[PDB]
């Protein structure tokens, strides 16, 4: 009963020999400010991959 | 004195203008130029001044 408990895909060619996903990440932050200012905080991002075979 | 543009003269070699707004983070800055040369006699001699009046 696997191939009708777990979902199957297609996503994958005959010849492929490993494969490789990705996942994404972000921090930041903000503030109060004035109508002159010359300072705000900035964000940024991440990443990270995994393997299979 | 007698007024003839050929005894003394004023030069504007360049009229007031104003440059297009730099931008900063929230606010703008606007420069402004002008170019003057000064009285220049030409033929003095046509000039009398009196002073101590």
């Given at each position: 009963?696997?191939?009708?408990?777990?979902?199957?895909?297609?996503?994958?060619?005959?010849?492929?020999?490993?494969?490789?996903?990705?996942?994404?990440?972000?921090?930041?932050?903000?503030?109060?400010?004035?109508?002159?200012?010359?300072?705000?905080p900035?964000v940024d991002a991440?990443?990270?991959?995994?393997?299979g075979? | 004195?007698?007024?003839?543009?050929?005894?003394?003269?004023?030069?504007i070699?360049?009229?007031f203008?104003?440059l297009?707004?730099?931008?900063?983070?929230?606010?703008?800055?606007?420069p402004?130029?002008?170019?003057?040369?000064?009285?220049?006699?030409?033929?003095?001699?046509?000039?009398?001044?009196?002073?101590?009046?």
């Amino acid at each position: 009963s696997a191939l009708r408990v777990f979902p199957v895909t297609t996503e994958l060619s005959p010849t492929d020999k490993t494969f490789e996903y990705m996942t994404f990440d972000k921090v930041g932050t903000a503030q109060i400010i004035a109508d002159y200012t010359d300072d705000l905080p900035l964000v940024d991002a991440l990443g990270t991959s995994e393997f299979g075979k | 004195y007698e007024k003839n543009p050929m005894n003394m003269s004023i030069e504007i070699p360049e009229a007031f203008n104003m440059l297009p707004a730099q931008p900063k983070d929230l606010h703008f800055k606007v420069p402004c130029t002008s170019k003057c040369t000064g009285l220049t006699i030409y033929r003095p001699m046509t000039i009398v001044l009196i002073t101590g009046v």
